Chains A and B, each alone.
Chain A
């Protein structure tokens, strides 16, 4: 039945659309982690060098 196949895929394809969004939300979560990790690494490395100079 062509109509039942069209209904079945129109439902089931939404799982791939959901994963397609979830991968980008994982990359965005990694961007917020890497923001804090990079910021902390930069600040502490420079702060210690600056403190040693004084």
Chain B
């Protein structure tokens, strides 16, 4: 039956769907993680500016 050749085509397409789907999920996870690290660094800069301001006072 033609199903033998059709599944040999679909095997490579299934690899594409799986690999690209995981990579799309990794992109969304990374964009959230970038913001969560940015929120820590801006507070560390703010604390240093606060210390300097109190010293100037």
- Given A16-B12, A23-B16, A43-B41, check contact A28 B26 (CB 8 Å): yes
A: interface residue count bin: 20 to 34
Q: How far is B16's CA from A20's CA once the two chains are assembled, in angstroms?
A: 4
How distant is B17 from chain A, measured CB to nearest CB, in Å?
A: 8
Residues of A with C-beta under 8 A to B53: 54
Q: How far is B19's CA from A31's CA once the two chains are assembled, in angstroms?
A: 14
Chain B facing A: main interface SS: helix
Q: How far is B14's CA from A26's CA once the two chains are assembled, in angstroms?
A: 18
- Given A20-B13, A23-B20, A30-B27, check contact A38 B34 (CB 8 Å): yes
CB proximity to B under 8 Å, residues A26-54: 27-28, 30-32, 34-36, 38-39, 42-43, 46-47, 50-51, 53-54
